[PDB]
Write an enzyme that holds these catalytic residues in place. Structure first.
Site, PDB file in Angstrom:
ATOM      1  N   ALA A 108       4.560 -11.042   5.208  1.00 28.58           N
ATOM      2  CA  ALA A 108       3.968 -11.376   6.495  1.00 28.58           C
ATOM      3  C   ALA A 108       2.755 -12.281   6.323  1.00 28.58           C
ATOM      4  CB  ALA A 108       3.585 -10.112   7.247  1.00 28.58           C
ATOM      5  N   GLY A 146       2.083  -3.730   6.545  1.00 28.54           N
ATOM      6  CA  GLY A 146       1.593  -2.379   6.741  1.00 28.54           C
ATOM      7  C   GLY A 146       1.053  -2.131   8.137  1.00 28.54           C
ATOM      8  N   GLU A 175       0.905  24.256  12.327  1.00 24.09           N
ATOM      9  CA  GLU A 175       0.021  25.263  12.900  1.00 24.09           C
ATOM     10  C   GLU A 175      -1.427  24.791  12.808  1.00 24.09           C
ATOM     11  OE1 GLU A 175       1.063  29.267  11.950  1.00 24.09           O
ATOM     12  OE2 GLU A 175      -1.001  29.998  12.115  1.00 24.09           O
ATOM     13  N   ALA A 234       0.824  -1.204   0.000  1.00 22.43           N
ATOM     14  CA  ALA A 234       0.000   0.000   0.000  1.00 22.43           C
ATOM     15  C   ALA A 234       0.859   1.256   0.000  1.00 22.43           C
ATOM     16  CB  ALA A 234      -0.935   0.002   1.197  1.00 22.43           C
TER      17      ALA A 234
HETATM   18  N1  LIG Z   1      -5.884   2.447  -1.419  1.00 27.31           N
HETATM   19  C1  LIG Z   1      -4.998   1.476  -1.625  1.00 27.31           C
HETATM   20  N2  LIG Z   1      -4.902   0.436  -0.724  1.00 27.31           N
HETATM   21  C2  LIG Z   1      -4.004  -0.558  -0.923  1.00 27.31           C
HETATM   22  C3  LIG Z   1      -3.173  -0.540  -2.033  1.00 27.31           C
HETATM   23  N3  LIG Z   1      -2.387  -1.635  -1.985  1.00 27.31           N
HETATM   24  C4  LIG Z   1      -2.698  -2.340  -0.875  1.00 27.31           C
HETATM   25  N4  LIG Z   1      -3.706  -1.691  -0.212  1.00 27.31           N
HETATM   26  C5  LIG Z   1      -4.330  -2.112   1.055  1.00 27.31           C
HETATM   27  O1  LIG Z   1      -3.442  -2.960   1.763  1.00 27.31           O
HETATM   28  C6  LIG Z   1      -4.137  -4.023   2.380  1.00 27.31           C
HETATM   29  C7  LIG Z   1      -3.280  -5.285   2.378  1.00 27.31           C
HETATM   30  O2  LIG Z   1      -1.919  -4.983   2.622  1.00 27.31           O
HETATM   31  P1  LIG Z   1      -0.909  -4.742   1.391  1.00 27.31           P
HETATM   32  O3  LIG Z   1      -0.528  -3.281   1.375  1.00 27.31           O
HETATM   33  O4  LIG Z   1      -1.558  -5.153   0.090  1.00 27.31           O
HETATM   34  O5  LIG Z   1       0.418  -5.619   1.667  1.00 27.31           O
HETATM   35  P2  LIG Z   1       1.142  -5.621   3.106  1.00 27.31           P
HETATM   36  O6  LIG Z   1       0.666  -4.417   3.883  1.00 27.31           O
HETATM   37  O7  LIG Z   1       2.638  -5.573   2.926  1.00 27.31           O
HETATM   38  O8  LIG Z   1       0.650  -6.985   3.821  1.00 27.31           O
HETATM   39  P3  LIG Z   1       1.365  -8.422   3.618  1.00 27.31           P
HETATM   40  O9  LIG Z   1       0.645  -9.200   2.543  1.00 27.31           O
HETATM   41  O10 LIG Z   1       1.280  -9.207   4.904  1.00 27.31           O
HETATM   42  O11 LIG Z   1       2.818  -8.254   3.246  1.00 27.31           O
HETATM   43  C8  LIG Z   1      -5.425  -4.197   1.587  1.00 27.31           C
HETATM   44  O12 LIG Z   1      -6.528  -4.368   2.447  1.00 27.31           O
HETATM   45  C9  LIG Z   1      -5.594  -2.918   0.794  1.00 27.31           C
HETATM   46  O13 LIG Z   1      -6.731  -2.225   1.249  1.00 27.31           O
HETATM   47  C10 LIG Z   1      -3.264   0.503  -2.945  1.00 27.31           C
HETATM   48  O14 LIG Z   1      -2.530   0.524  -3.931  1.00 27.31           O
HETATM   49  N5  LIG Z   1      -4.180   1.511  -2.735  1.00 27.31           N
END
Ligand SMILES: Nc1nc2c(ncn2[C@@H]2O[C@H](COP(=O)(O)OP(=O)(O)OP(=O)(O)O)[C@@H](O)[C@H]2O)c(=O)[nH]1
Ligand SMILES: Nc1nc2c(ncn2[C@@H]2O[C@H](COP(=O)(O)OP(=O)(O)O)[C@@H](O)[C@H]2O)c(=O)[nH]1
Ligand SMILES: CCOc1ccc(C2=Nn3c(nnc3-c3ccccc3OC)SC2)cc1
Ligand SMILES: [Ca+2]
Ligand SMILES: [Mg+2]
Ligand SMILES: [Mg+2]
Lengths: 67, 421, 440
Positions: free
Chosen positions: C99, C146, C254, C12
């Site tokens: 993860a 994340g 601010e 993400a």
């Molecule tokens: N808005 C938005 N959300 C994202 C995007 N990519 C991933 N997400 C969100 O991230 C969540 C899952 O985590 P990811 O970012 O895909 O991957 P990660 O955080 O590294 O998790 P792991 O698979 O355990 O490695 C999903 O529920 C999505 O909502 C994106 O490009 N845009």
């Protein structure tokens, strides 16, 4: 008032340092707890598998006593 | 970089495993010689998942052939895509199992298990990041059932943090080799619940009815049954072999489909055997399940499906949310958003568009109730126990296997009758 | 001076960062190779764009950011992307195993191997700054990396940098685009841990963004590219006060002074305007008075909730483009008499307005239309508690049967961590009620 200004700035540093101190301890706690727990689950899982080996040794032994 | 070590054991396990490699080789553009002659670069982006890149740009399948008799493994070599396998990965015996679970798990298989592991370690040290192990075998036999569950327990000793996947083949009176099949099945299930993370229930009774009723085959040979198994396995690993918006691996699949470590047996489904709503309604149909279990007799815990072929992304999302609203009674409330679905742009060979299904329904207990019934029907009269007791076993181990399987059914019954409030 | 080191964790944060930094280069005029012809000062400078971009000897303007992921398949696209020369190899950190959507694996198992490496890369960026101002963490609430690795990172940053400001840009999960189940599990766990280590956190509901791109951009099935490019505009407008200068420009810190009345209440409700396609923008000028009314519309908010059903504790307006105070003061006066704006009795009702004269920029090929003016509203409302309500409900459904918990326990965590995280979340919702109740 001079000794009051010293108390305020010194207290801010004390609270800030305490925040870093407590955070480090809280973190090291979880990291150590999670380590011991994960090792325990692996130790328990391997033990159950080693019991299957001991059980497997008795089966081949039980057949040997029938020959 | 996410490699998966494939293992096949038993007469059934090797044939259904051979068909698996033949199909996916076509979908990745891999000739029996081991070269590449595809047209898309989407075939080589995740090619190292099941194949090893050797000298001369060869793609050797990361597969280990295991058996207790040369009879089955000889056919694989002389047959199509037989020169593509690594000659040192062929580990076979001579004595055989004689359709005996005892010989496969304790006697014969224990004499050959160590030789198999040497091949496993060699194929695991060349992995950049080993996912886990997928095993194709039968539970109604001797080698596939006995040594199959034996290999698993031995693997988890060296690889405890790796995911254990299996494609177990459930025995059936319709396609029965011997009479001691319910024994071998029960003793196998007793092992699978304890040492597996996810297991595909490929029931022969379900395969037989599909070929007989739907496919209109009066005399369904083993070749007709495997054609449904090949397409099933080709689907469930589509996201694993083909790139996309979803980064898929074995563990992540296990995390999302297994809410409880014991309830890890799924219900495969494929369609067809045409538009999007039609393909969708036929995927949740009881006639298109690879396990003889009516999904409306129980409730779903976790559901996942693939849609292969060029189609509308909007239409798919609508149909999936349409089958949930019209059937909200067949899904647990305590697991929010328990239905996921991804779309692959590359369709299977000979189909405009298909649909593969995976469900962790509580109606899977019917499969276990059937086997348990056949098991207790012979065990109460102590029938054919001299085959197992003569190998060093006792009636206590059979009791545990029965008791453990009976508990599993009660566990499926518990979370089925469980509510939200 | 006053630099801001951005941090992108997980698929993400990285992919969002790809849209954010691409947008930054377009607004400032930085080529994908890193060259910036408008910048005459070689080697460095004290300009406004030096907060997010450091300078080299070759004239290459390098972003002050670190991309980290437990699996390389995401960042590898950046290494070979269009802006591959813009970053230094020591800023793109990758592992070998993700993860697998597990908080425990992200925070403990896999994360511990790379966490010391990441900090050392962060430290190197900190030692290049004349005066650090804070950090910017981009992550998702539900992703194992994340949510897991972020919480592990935020704790370490609080130790290695004391009480230096750390702002979040979390991604609130949504069923329409939910990657995997157990999203509420990872969400509650990362919200509980980062809570005392985050000075301000901007939430973004994926469903809220998804609904806008279908309504305002007329897209049937919006991809991550469509969403991230929209989010980047919000992030751009927020950091516009840090990347640019002006007589009417007001620093973000601010605004943050007003947005955070209590340490636990640091979740503002962002709202952007106008979002409109090029077809609908042709021959239709959207005045200052029109884009302001769009800010007080629930359909254009980054998080799905009802401000009319709650109370305001703070309200800020960050205008950008051709905007004068005369129109703003005339607009606000109109809205104040036609909206359900109800403040609590322990804070002023006046709005804080910031204006940046640099006109908004759109990504070439993007669905957003090149408008003359835009506005981002950062309002601290108690109605944002509705977001925690829908999330806690879904959490309580699965934990009532202990579903999927064994995957967390098996990695080292205890059920105590789950029960402690939920009781804290229940305390947070209560605090949002306490601040809403009128005085005695
Ligand atoms: N808005 C938005 N959300 C994202 C995007 N990519 C991933 N997400 C969100 O991230 C969540 C899952 O985590 P990811 O970012 O895909 O991957 P990660 O955080 O590294 O998790 P792991 O698979 O355990 O490695 C999903 O529920 C999505 O909502 C994106 O490009 N845009
Ligand atoms: N689908 C399928 N099932 C098979 C095949 N061969 C055997 N089976 C099933 O497996 C059971 C017998 O297992 P068997 O192959 O003898 O195991 P082994 O002796 O250990 O190799 C029977 O109940 C069959 O239904 C096959 O080629 N395809
Ligand atoms: C019910 C809970 O929600 C879920 C969340 C994530 C998944 C993932 N799918 N996945 C993976 N490997 N094979 C698959 C799969 C297998 C069969 C059909 C469809 C598939 O997905 C394309 S990785 C994670 C599945 C369900
Ligand atoms: Ca300069
Ligand atoms: Mg046979
Ligand atoms: Mg990811």
């Amino acid at each position: 008032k001079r000794e009051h200004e010293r108390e305020v700035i010194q207290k801010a540093i004390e609270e800030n340092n305490n925040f870093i101190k407590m955070a480090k301890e809280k973190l090291a706690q979880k990291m150590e707890s999670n380590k011991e727990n994960r090792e325990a689950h692996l130790a328990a899982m391997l033990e159950r598998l080693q019991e299957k080996d001991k059980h497997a040794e008795e089966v081949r032994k039980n057949k040997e006593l029938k020959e | 970089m996410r490699e998966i070590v494939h293992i096949q054991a038993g007469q059934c396990g090797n044939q259904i495993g051979a068909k698996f490699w033949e199909v996916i080789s076509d979908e990745h553009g891999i000739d029996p010689t081991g070269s590449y002659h595809g047209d898309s670069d989407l075939q080589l982006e995740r090619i190292n998942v099941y194949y090893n890149e050797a000298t001369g740009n060869k793609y050797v399948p990361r597969a280990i052939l295991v058996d207790l008799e040369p009879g089955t493994m000889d056919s694989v070599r002389s047959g199509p895509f037989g020169q593509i396998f690594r000659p040192d990965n062929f580990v076979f015996g001579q004595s055989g199992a004689g359709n005996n679970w005892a010989k496969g798990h304790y006697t014969e298989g224990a004499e050959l298990v160590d030789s198999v592991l040497d091949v496993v370690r060699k194929e695991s040290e060349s992995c950049d990041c080993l996912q886990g192990f997928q095993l194709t075998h039968s539970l109604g036999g001797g080698t596939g059932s006995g040594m199959g569950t034996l290999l698993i327990s031995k693997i988890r000793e060296e690889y405890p943090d790796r995911i254990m996947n299996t494609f177990s083949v459930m025995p059936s009176p319709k396609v029965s080799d011997t009479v001691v099949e319910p024994y071998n099945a029960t003793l196998s299930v007793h092992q699978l619940v304890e040492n597996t993370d996810e297991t595909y229930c490929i029931d022969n009774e379900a395969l037989y009815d599909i070929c007989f009723r739907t496919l209109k085959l009066t005399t369904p040979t083993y070749g007709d049954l495997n054609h449904l198994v090949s397409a099933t396995m080709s689907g469930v690993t589509t996201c694993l072999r083909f790139p996309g918006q979803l980064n898929a691996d074995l563990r992540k699949l296990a995390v999302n489909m297994v809410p409880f470590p014991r309830l890890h047996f799924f219900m495969p489904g494929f369609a067809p055997l045409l538009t999007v709503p039609e393909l969708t309604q036929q995927m949740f149909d009881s006639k298109n399940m690879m396990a003889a279990c009516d999904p409306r007799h129980g409730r779903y815990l976790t559901v996942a499906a693939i849609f292969r072929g060029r189609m509308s992304m909007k239409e798919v999302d609508e149909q999936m949310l349409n089958v949930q609203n019209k059937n909200s009674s067949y899904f647990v409330e305590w697991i929010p958003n328990n239905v996921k679905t991804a779309v692959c742009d590359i369709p299977p060979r000979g189909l405009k568009m298909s649909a593969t299904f995976i469900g962790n329904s509580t109606a899977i207990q019917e499969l276990f109730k059937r086997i348990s019934e056949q098991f207790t029907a012979m065990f109460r009269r102590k029938a054919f126990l001299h085959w197992y007791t003569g190998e060093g076993m006792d009636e206590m181990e059979f009791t545990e296997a029965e008791s453990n399987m009976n508990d599993l059914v009660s566990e499926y019954q518990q979370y089925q009758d469980a509510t939200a409030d | 001076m006053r630099e801001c080191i951005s941090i992108h964790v997980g698929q993400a944060g990285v992919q969002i960062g790809n849209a954010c930094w691409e947008l930054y280069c377009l607004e400032h005029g930085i080529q994908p190779d890193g060259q910036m012809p408008s910048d005459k000062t070689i080697g460095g400078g004290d300009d406004s764009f030096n907060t997010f971009f450091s300078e080299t000897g070759a004239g290459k303007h390098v972003p002050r950011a670190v991309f980290v992921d437990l699996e390389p398949t995401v960042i590898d696209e950046v290494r070979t992307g269009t802006y591959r020369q813009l970053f230094h190899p020591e800023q793109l950190i990758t592992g070998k195993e993700d993860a697998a959507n597990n908080y425990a694996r992200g925070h403990y198992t896999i994360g511990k191997e790379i966490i010391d490496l990441v900090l050392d890369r962060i430290r190197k960026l900190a030692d290049q700054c004349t005066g650090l101002q804070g950090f910017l963490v981009f992550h998702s609430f539900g992703g194992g990396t994340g949510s897991g690795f972020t919480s592990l990172l935020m704790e370490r940053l609080s130790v290695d940098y004391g009480k230096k400001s750390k702002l979040e840009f979390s991604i609130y999960p949504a069923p329409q685009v939910s990657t995997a189940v157990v999203e509420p599990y990872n969400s509650i766990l990362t919200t509980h841990t980062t809570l005392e280590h985050s000075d301000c956190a901007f939430m973004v509901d994926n469903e809220a963004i998804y609904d806008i791109c279908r309504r305002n951009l007329d897209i049937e099935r919006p991809t991550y590219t469509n969403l991230n490019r929209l989010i980047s505009q919000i992030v751009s407008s927020i950091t516009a006060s840090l990347r640019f200068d002006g007589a009417l420009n007001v620093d973000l810190t601010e605004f943050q002074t007003n947005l955070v009345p209590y340490p636990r209440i640091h979740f503002p409700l962002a709202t952007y305007a106008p979002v409109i396609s090029a077809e609908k923008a042709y021959h239709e000028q959207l005045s200052v008075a029109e884009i302001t009314n769009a800010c007080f519309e629930p359909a254009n908010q980054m998080v799905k909730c009802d401000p009319r059903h709650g109370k305001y504790m703070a309200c800020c307006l960050l205008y950008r483009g051709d905007v004068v105070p005369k129109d703003v003061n005339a607009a606000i006066a109109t809205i104040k008499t036609k909206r359900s704006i109800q403040f609590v009795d322990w804070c002023p009702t006046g709005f804080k307005v910031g204006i940046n004269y640099q006109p908004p920029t759109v990504v070439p090929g993007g669905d957003l239309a090149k408008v003359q003016r835009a506005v981002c509203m950062l309002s601290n409302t108690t109605a944002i508690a509705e977001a925690w309500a829908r999330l806690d409900h879904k959490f309580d459904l699965m934990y009532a049967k202990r579903a999927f918990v064994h995957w967390y326990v098996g990695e080292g965590m205890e059920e105590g961590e789950f029960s402690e995280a939920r009781e804290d979340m229940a305390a947070l919702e209560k605090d949002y009620e306490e601040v809403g109740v009128d005085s005695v």
